[PDB]
Motif scaffolding. Sequence first.
Motif, mmCIF file in Angstrom:
data_model
loop_
_atom_site.group_PDB
_atom_site.id
_atom_site.type_symbol
_atom_site.label_atom_id
_atom_site.label_comp_id
_atom_site.label_asym_id
_atom_site.label_seq_id
_atom_site.Cartn_x
_atom_site.Cartn_y
_atom_site.Cartn_z
ATOM 1 N N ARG B 77 -51.303 -63.247 22.492
ATOM 2 C CA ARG B 77 -50.641 -62.568 23.591
ATOM 3 C C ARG B 77 -51.367 -61.287 23.963
ATOM 4 O O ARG B 77 -51.444 -60.933 25.141
ATOM 5 C CB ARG B 77 -49.188 -62.296 23.231
ATOM 6 N N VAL B 108 -54.348 -64.413 43.813
ATOM 7 C CA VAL B 108 -53.716 -63.658 42.743
ATOM 8 C C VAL B 108 -52.212 -63.560 42.941
ATOM 9 O O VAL B 108 -51.431 -63.862 42.036
ATOM 10 C CB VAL B 108 -54.335 -62.254 42.607
ATOM 11 N N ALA B 125 -44.196 -52.993 32.884
ATOM 12 C CA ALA B 125 -45.367 -52.556 32.138
ATOM 13 C C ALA B 125 -46.654 -53.033 32.791
ATOM 14 O O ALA B 125 -47.700 -52.399 32.626
ATOM 15 C CB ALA B 125 -45.290 -53.050 30.698
HETATM 16 C C1 LIG Z 1 -56.103 -64.520 39.120
HETATM 17 C C2 LIG Z 1 -54.628 -64.306 39.350
HETATM 18 C C3 LIG Z 1 -53.920 -64.775 38.114
HETATM 19 C C4 LIG Z 1 -53.141 -64.037 37.103
HETATM 20 C C5 LIG Z 1 -52.883 -62.562 37.172
HETATM 21 C C6 LIG Z 1 -52.721 -65.075 36.101
HETATM 22 C C7 LIG Z 1 -51.828 -64.791 34.915
HETATM 23 C C8 LIG Z 1 -51.337 -65.578 33.736
HETATM 24 N N1 LIG Z 1 -50.958 -64.769 32.707
HETATM 25 C C9 LIG Z 1 -50.597 -65.572 31.680
HETATM 26 C C10 LIG Z 1 -50.086 -65.102 30.367
HETATM 27 C C11 LIG Z 1 -49.856 -63.787 29.734
HETATM 28 N N2 LIG Z 1 -50.007 -62.604 30.354
HETATM 29 C C12 LIG Z 1 -49.706 -61.649 29.449
HETATM 30 C C13 LIG Z 1 -49.756 -60.238 29.950
HETATM 31 C C14 LIG Z 1 -49.128 -59.079 29.596
HETATM 32 N N3 LIG Z 1 -48.330 -58.712 28.587
HETATM 33 C C15 LIG Z 1 -47.892 -57.475 28.642
HETATM 34 O O1 LIG Z 1 -47.110 -56.956 27.872
HETATM 35 C C16 LIG Z 1 -48.481 -56.775 29.799
HETATM 36 C C17 LIG Z 1 -47.426 -56.137 30.679
HETATM 37 C C18 LIG Z 1 -49.371 -57.846 30.427
HETATM 38 C C19 LIG Z 1 -50.838 -57.386 30.461
HETATM 39 C C20 LIG Z 1 -51.075 -56.438 31.603
HETATM 40 C C21 LIG Z 1 -49.368 -62.240 28.127
HETATM 41 C C22 LIG Z 1 -49.006 -61.600 26.847
HETATM 42 C C23 LIG Z 1 -49.451 -63.689 28.308
HETATM 43 C C24 LIG Z 1 -49.188 -64.766 27.264
HETATM 44 C C25 LIG Z 1 -47.760 -65.239 27.363
HETATM 45 C C26 LIG Z 1 -47.390 -66.279 26.320
HETATM 46 O O2 LIG Z 1 -48.242 -66.735 25.407
HETATM 47 O O3 LIG Z 1 -46.205 -66.675 26.338
HETATM 48 C C27 LIG Z 1 -50.719 -67.017 31.987
HETATM 49 C C28 LIG Z 1 -50.437 -68.242 31.134
HETATM 50 C C29 LIG Z 1 -51.670 -69.028 30.707
HETATM 51 C C30 LIG Z 1 -52.851 -68.315 30.072
HETATM 52 O O4 LIG Z 1 -52.927 -67.071 29.939
HETATM 53 O O5 LIG Z 1 -53.760 -69.070 29.661
HETATM 54 C C31 LIG Z 1 -51.235 -67.026 33.364
HETATM 55 C C32 LIG Z 1 -51.510 -68.284 34.119
HETATM 56 N N4 LIG Z 1 -53.188 -66.286 36.475
HETATM 57 C C33 LIG Z 1 -53.871 -66.131 37.594
HETATM 58 O O6 LIG Z 1 -54.448 -67.107 38.188
#
Ligand SMILES: CCC1=C(C)/C(=C/C2=NC(=C\c3[nH]c(/C=C4\NC(=O)[C@H](C)[C@H]4CC)c(C)c3CCC(=O)O)/C(CCC(=O)O)=C2C)NC1=O
Lengths: 161, 161, 161, 161, 48, 49, 92, 160, 173, 160, 160, 160
Positions: B77, B108, B125
Amino acid sequence: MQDAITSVINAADVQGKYLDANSVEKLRGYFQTGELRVRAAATIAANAATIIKEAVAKSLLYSDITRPGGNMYTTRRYAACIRDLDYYLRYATYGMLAGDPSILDERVLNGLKETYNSLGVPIGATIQAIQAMKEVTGSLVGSDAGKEMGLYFDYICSGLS
Amino acid sequence: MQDAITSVINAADVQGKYLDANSVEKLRGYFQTGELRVRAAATIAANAATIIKEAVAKSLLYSDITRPGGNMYTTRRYAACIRDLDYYLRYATYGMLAGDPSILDERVLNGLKETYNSLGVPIGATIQAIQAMKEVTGSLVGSDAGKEMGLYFDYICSGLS
Amino acid sequence: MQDAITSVINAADVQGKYLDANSVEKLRGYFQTGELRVRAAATIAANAATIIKEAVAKSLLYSDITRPGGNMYTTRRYAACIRDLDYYLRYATYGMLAGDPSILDERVLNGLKETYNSLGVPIGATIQAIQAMKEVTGSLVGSDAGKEMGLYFDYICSGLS
Amino acid sequence: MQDAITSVINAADVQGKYLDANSVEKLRGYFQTGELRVRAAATIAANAATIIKEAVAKSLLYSDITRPGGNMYTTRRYAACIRDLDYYLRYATYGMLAGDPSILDERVLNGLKETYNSLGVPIGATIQAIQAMKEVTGSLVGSDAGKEMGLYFDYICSGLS
Amino acid sequence: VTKASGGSPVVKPQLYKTASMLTIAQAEQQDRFLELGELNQLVSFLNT
Amino acid sequence: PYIRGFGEEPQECRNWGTQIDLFQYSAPFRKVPQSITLFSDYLKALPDQ
Amino acid sequence: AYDMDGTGAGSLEPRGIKSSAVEKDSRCFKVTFVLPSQSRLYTFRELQNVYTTKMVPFSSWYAEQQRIQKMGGKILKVELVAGGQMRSVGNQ
Amino acid sequence: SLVTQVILSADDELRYPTAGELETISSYLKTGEYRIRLISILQGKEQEIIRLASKKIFQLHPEYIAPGGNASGARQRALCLRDYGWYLRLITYAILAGDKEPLEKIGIIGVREMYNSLGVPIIGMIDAIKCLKEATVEVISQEEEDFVAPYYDYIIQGMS
Amino acid sequence: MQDIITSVINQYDLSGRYLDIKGINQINNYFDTGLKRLMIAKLINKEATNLIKEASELLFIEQPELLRPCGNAFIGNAYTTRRYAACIRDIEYYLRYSAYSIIAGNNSILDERVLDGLKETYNSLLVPIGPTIRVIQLLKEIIQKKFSTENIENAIIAEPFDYLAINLSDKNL
Amino acid sequence: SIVTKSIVNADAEARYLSPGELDRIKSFVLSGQRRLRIAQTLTENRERIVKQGGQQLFQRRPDVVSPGGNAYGEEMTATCLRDLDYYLRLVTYGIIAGDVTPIEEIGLVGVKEMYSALGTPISGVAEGIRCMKDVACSLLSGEDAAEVGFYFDYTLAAMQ
Amino acid sequence: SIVTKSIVNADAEARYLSPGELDRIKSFVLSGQRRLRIAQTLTENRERIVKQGGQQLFQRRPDVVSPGGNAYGEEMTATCLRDLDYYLRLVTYGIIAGDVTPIEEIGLVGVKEMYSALGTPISGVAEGIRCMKDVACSLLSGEDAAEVGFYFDYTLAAMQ
Amino acid sequence: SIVTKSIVNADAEARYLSPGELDRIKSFVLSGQRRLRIAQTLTENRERIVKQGGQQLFQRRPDVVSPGGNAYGEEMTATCLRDLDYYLRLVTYGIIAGDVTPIEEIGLVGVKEMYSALGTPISGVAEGIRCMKDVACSLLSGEDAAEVGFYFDYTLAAMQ
Ligand SMILES: CCC1=C(C)/C(=C/C2=NC(=C\c3[nH]c(/C=C4\NC(=O)[C@H](C)[C@H]4CC)c(C)c3CCC(=O)O)/C(CCC(=O)O)=C2C)NC1=O
Ligand SMILES: CCC1=C(C)/C(=C/C2=NC(=C\c3[nH]c(/C=C4\NC(=O)[C@H](C)[C@H]4CC)c(C)c3CCC(=O)O)/C(CCC(=O)O)=C2C)NC1=O
Ligand SMILES: CCC1=C(C)/C(=C/C2=NC(=C\c3[nH]c(/C=C4\NC(=O)[C@H](C)[C@H]4CC)c(C)c3CCC(=O)O)/C(CCC(=O)O)=C2C)NC1=O
Ligand SMILES: CCC1=C(C)/C(=C/C2=NC(=C\c3[nH]c(/C=C4\NC(=O)[C@H](C)[C@H]4CC)c(C)c3CCC(=O)O)/C(CCC(=O)O)=C2C)NC1=O
Ligand SMILES: CCC1=C(C)/C(=C/C2=NC(=C\c3[nH]c(/C=C4\NC(=O)[C@H](C)[C@H]4CC)c(C)c3CCC(=O)O)/C(CCC(=O)O)=C2C)NC1=O
Ligand SMILES: CCC1=C(C)/C(=C/C2=NC(=C\c3[nH]c(/C=C4\NC(=O)[C@H](C)[C@H]4CC)c(C)c3CCC(=O)O)/C(CCC(=O)O)=C2C)NC1=O
Ligand SMILES: CCC1=C(C)/C(=C/C2=NC(=C\c3[nH]c(/C=C4\NC(=O)[C@H](C)[C@H]4CC)c(C)c3CCC(=O)O)/C(CCC(=O)O)=C2C)NC1=O
Ligand SMILES: CCC1=C(C)/C(=C/C2=NC(=C\c3[nH]c(/C=C4\NC(=O)[C@H](C)[C@H]4CC)c(C)c3CCC(=O)O)/C(CCC(=O)O)=C2C)NC1=O
Ligand SMILES: CCC1=C(C)/C(=C/C2=NC(=C\c3[nH]c(/C=C4\NC(=O)[C@H](C)[C@H]4CC)c(C)c3CCC(=O)O)/C(CCC(=O)O)=C2C)NC1=O
């Protein structure tokens, strides 16, 4: 349904801490633009019918959605448009005062694109109407106020897309 | 997916008219800032990993999303975050060069806030990470270039909200 | 909710053209059968209770849906049937007059098969009741009128399947 | 996809604490029934075809879903049933071994009732087939093992309802 | 009449390329930053 | 293998909305099957909603 | 599991390629063939080399060898590089 | 041919030909010689017909014959009748094997890029085949020319 | 899809009964006009590339707006030749699937392969539905020009084109 | 039409159609021959019925066409007559449907919202339809003018 | 039918129907008069074709009806003949559709899963259809018996 | 755990669990009494296993704690030991789950992205876990030290 002050209080409360210098720093930034937003919401209330009349005549007045077969042909269907465009210009006014677009998706965006697909309302022509409506709104309230009111129009256009 | 020149050509073409003085007037305004955008996109490519390392350490490094139970606990994560923050700093670089935020919502913004709600990713966040990432980006590229790159960061933050 | 004239006017209007020779050609075909449909709807109104009494006694009167455990056992459940079969013989009469089955799916078919599955109503026995009800309706109104009234019964049976 | 040990480790990990006496207290309770679940999953693997043959003949073999018009008439449609009932008896075996019904809604329940409504599959007859299949499963594995395997059948029936 | 619906998302069909455009898109398509050549590639067109 | 987008190939009218949904990053979170229900409701009558 | 569950004619999954491969088979061939596309002149896609030599598994050689001739291909040489012959247990 | 389409179309499903397909082979083979008798009628009128095709393809299109056009000159016009001869020869193949593949595996598949690399206007060749079908009606009676009519207009549909 | 025959046989299978004589009378009405349904189809193959050309000029002669700039509504009419090339291509399809559907004697092939998602696709590209339906019946009058002295071929030709018209309509009444 | 709302009336009441409803569907379809003749008169008189319709409209309401009026200039006056062509078309639908149901859900429901939102004086467009009515009833006999005029004045009533 | 899969064949190939496809839709509809006569013979001979069908089936497979057989007793033997009435009905559909497409998606697709899941010997039901075939072809001439028997043996092939 | 991935293995293969899979779920649950004793030893020895774990880590890697090292000062050194408390906790999960599946998706998947993005030397944290392993295996017998050490070295392998 949170304004800029409600969102600042929520984030500062959700960690259980007081309103530190960073939380009040944004609140002071919102109070500085408090004078601009009311005058922006002032003129928009005055020229509500004029703005919507300008947008539809500039974007989708003579296109073939207006003609027979198009999505806006019958008078009930045409009258639903200016009723429908009134909410976008109205709720965008609320977001401009509250300084937070939470009211839009709470009361406008949710179930909206899923509703137009049911009725068969063209989302493409809808966004261009709001874009043209955003263009005339920058005429009235000025540049920076148009930047503020315009910041919530494309928020509707983005989520409605 | 339109740049400033594509958007100018589209609006001038959509009315079937040639590129008059007003259409070329904005195009000349874009060519004047063409030198600024490349150098802005130059340094951002160099310090991509350094900018993201600075933003997360300045916004959400030690908050309890980082601790157990928080939204960023496990290494998969955590690793998804810097992968995720890389797109925001990367696609914002594309908008800064193209001079038009059409690529952001095209690639995006659409289905983004609807995706984070599915995963349960905290949008609050996320925006503060992008805001902190916007703050460090103004450090590198300068003031006006930071104003340009910063103009697309809050576009992401607005629509993602 | 369109009749044959409403459907002809809609298709001729949806292209924005007048009622040409082909549109009026079908309208003349509908007016020729206007005398047949009223007399068909005349006798069906008279023998409404007799037709439903004949269908249930000929299709599902003594089958084990009628016995305990079957889908039609209790008097409330039996009484719901002849109430339910009355709509099929009634709405089919409306389609026979309007000359267009749009009223059926508008007011009968939608959410119907999805409703019987909820209650657990056997769709198999339902269609055979309507088929038997279609068989007696051809007795009263004659052959060609039975062909007309029968053309909407199997429309219900098809969509309800 | 978590078993009893995975769910115990997750809840003990999600608070960032070690496996205290209460977390290991349930784990010891799961290891005590580890011998019962394998023998339960042993005989169910042996009599998989016999159990499904007993359930359909006891619940919905001769009902009018089996006859023409019913939801199970054609041989493709009948063959889909025993294929479909095989998953319920199979995935319930997985829940009985893992000691946690997370695999069911992960891989069976989600989009299931929304799928049967699309096809028009009767949810009422489906649950009674699983109830009858639960009744024969208590025959083979015994009383308490049937209580365990039966505890996941009605979990499917509850969510599928 | 059609009794179902997949939805109509806002799609903008392509119309043309520009020198300012496509190599912003090529480096985009690989999910990598602008490289020195294709970013020096963006430069000397805006100097025209 | 590439993704056969809209401006690649002569597309078909029948899965227009779904395919544009599938060629998005939001695809792996529609845990409900989008295509098997849509291709089946094309034949059945209007649903209750 | 394996491709010989009992499927044949008149069975619910459609009549298709049935390979005699065991559970998680570890035998693979080394094949060589040309396979002209015979469809580029109404599709106008880009061109790809049609002469390939690759290792196909035993689990799916028959489907591939059955398909290479479907589109007019010619198989120049195939061998069983990995795996035994007449081996009752151990193909897994 | 038609049996080849049934063997192929039944082979990708891994099954023997069904009841309907074996009709399609049996009915095709019972109409066998009548295609054989018909092609000998057309082979004796190939010098008949292509002379009539050059009648109206050029009075309709003097652009090609004139100095500057592609068909200007003797040797350019010499093969011009040869392309009619190959097309008419192909149609005798198509009339025999009762389907379109000899008109499609040859002649149709990729014909535009052949002509476009030659300079022959592809619209003119469509009228050439339409001219050729116009010429075949005169040396053929009403019974059998609608047997050969659907084989011509497939070529026009293939060329557009 | 389903022709008139298979649609008739499914009609009697749902009720699980053999084919009676009312069922067979419906099949015989197809077998009588079946020989007439072919030269309608055979005329279309001979008149295909033409019949699209007369439809286009008859369309744009009444809708000159379709050959003009769209207005700021980014709408897909035949503005550019790229737009014009694809836009003539749609008239190919409406003539084609309405040619098979003349031979099947039933509009089952129409809705599942043309109608399903048609308003979906055109609402995405903002395509005209009004002029799109009008060109469908310009073809219908153009095809009926050939078979006009009698009037039993006319109902056959009208059935596919009339079905697309009523179904592509947003229902005013 | 009279057929569709005589159905939906008896539809809501859980009953079939009475003799009062079925002796009028019967009476309407025998009236159908005479209705198409009446609509056929207004169909190819739209050139005079509209152009003379806007004739009296401007003579009675010069404000709407004068500078400052809503229909001022070459542009708006063309659309000024376009709406009259619309409403003249809907009256042809109402005559053939035997009811203002086509005119109801087209051009009447929510018409005041449109014209108020367009800046058009709704009373002015009502004056336009009345001018068309005198031209229309002048084209028909007394038995017909009691119908063709009858649908206009309903449109006059709902348009104010 | 031959009409629906000759369409979906040419549908997938992005093309119209060839003469090979349209001279057989043509050839099939002229065959339609003779098909209804053949299906009309089997329609009201189901009493003998089924009952004599189960005649030879039990005299050839006494195991299935003996105690322990799947069709044992008054109950199962009635259903034992019910399936033969089904498959005799589908053959009447295939004769009128000119193909086993009706027999394909009814009673053939996944048939081994049903009968294996019912405990019925699938080879036994195949023997039943063969016994019906000799009764059916004994009711028709040689030209017809090459068709009515032709659809049974396809059902025999897919049922094993 | 061994229970969840022995299921998802046989889940993907469309089959049930073999004796090889069910004689090990059986063999694992009888092993469960001995696993909780082993994890119970590491549970309330984290004070010594972590603090002596960071003991040898700084003696072997003084760079990371020296001025300029990532864990320099009172602050980072506390977090320097915090991660060791994390990884010592995950080893207690892996011992009770009988597999590194808990350690896999926590602290191992994408671990190089985190520590590279934090500026921490990933080789340094690998040295820390090895120092904890010698302290952990020194607290248990030989039969147990082949397990508790066994999960550490897997974490060592994936952490480089
Ligand atoms: C190009 C445009 C675009 C975006 C932005 C995008 C996002 C995206 N973010 C993901 C997960 C994720 N994103 C986060 C992010 C965060 N956790 C926090 O506490 C923060 C607030 C944040 C970082 C800034 C996390 C932790 C996961 C994993 C969630 C999980 O395993 O359940 C996933 C699930 C699959 C993967 O990561 O392989 C997608 C598809 N996809 C896209 O096509
Ligand atoms: C406050 C948030 C909110 C919105 C936005 C909303 C929209 C909404 N728009 C509707 C209809 C409609 N909307 C339109 C709109 C348009 N036609 C076009 O061509 C244009 C692109 C577009 C004008 C911009 C039309 C024509 C209808 C009528 C559809 C019909 O009668 O089938 C309807 C159906 C019921 C009714 O209008 O009474 C709803 C509920 N509801 C809400 O609660
Ligand atoms: C692993 C979790 C899971 C389930 C449960 C599942 C169900 C599922 N059941 C289906 C059909 C079906 N299911 C049935 C079932 C029934 N008919 C009855 O009367 C009974 C009440 C019931 C048997 C208990 C039938 C008849 C069909 C075929 C429907 C058709 O052809 O229209 C289909 C359509 C495709 C196919 O079968 O190939 C799916 C996807 N998919 C999954 O991934
Ligand atoms: C359509 C043209 C064609 C043919 C003929 C063909 C044959 C072929 N036969 C195979 C195996 C085999 N073939 C046999 C056959 C035999 N054993 C005997 O003793 C007999 C002499 C003989 C039966 C007549 C056996 C036993 C195997 C399995 C070999 C193994 O598991 O090692 C395999 C390996 C893969 C598989 O069966 O899934 C292929 C590809 N492939 C084709 O595409
Ligand atoms: C079996 C199918 C088949 C065809 C048709 C074919 C055609 C063909 N036509 C050619 C040339 C040509 N073809 C034409 C044709 C014409 N000028 C007109 O006005 C007419 C409309 C038309 C003839 C009826 C001309 C003028 C050239 C010479 C162009 C040049 O080389 O300058 C050439 C270059 C060599 C040659 O003449 O043999 C080929 C290969 N090859 C094939 O394999
Ligand atoms: C088989 C049934 C079927 C149809 C009909 C169909 C239509 C279809 N029309 C398209 C585009 C289009 N269609 C038009 C058509 C028109 N423009 C106008 O102004 C006129 C009203 C109209 C011509 C009558 C235009 C301009 C585009 C391109 C839009 C653009 O890129 O601007 C596209 C996107 C390009 C593509 O084909 O991949 C599809 C899929 N697909 C199907 O499967
Ligand atoms: C079928 C029912 C129906 C009606 C009636 C209808 C009316 C309608 N009238 C319009 C404009 C207009 N209508 C007028 C009308 C008038 N000016 C005057 O002085 C007169 C009082 C009056 C005419 C007698 C004018 C001037 C405009 C243009 C207004 C502008 O450009 O701002 C427009 C916008 C442009 C267009 O798409 O045509 C519509 C949709 N639409 C319908 O679907
Ligand atoms: C139209 C295609 C089609 C077929 C073929 C079909 C078969 C079918 N056969 C059934 C039973 C049965 N079928 C048999 C059949 C036989 N016993 C024997 O010894 C013989 C070998 C054989 C008959 C020749 C028996 C004994 C049962 C009852 C089994 C039981 O009660 O457990 C049942 C369950 C009861 C019912 O609903 O009728 C079905 C659905 N359904 C279909 O939709
Ligand atoms: C359960 C799996 C897991 C791990 C491992 C994890 C690590 C992790 N280590 C961190 C920091 C840190 N980690 C170190 C670590 C070290 N310095 C050294 O010299 C040594 C080589 C090394 C320790 C042995 C330091 C110095 C920081 C603070 C870095 C900074 O302040 O910039 C942080 C940011 C602050 C925090 O939220 O704690 C996280 C999230 N999170 C997890 O969920």
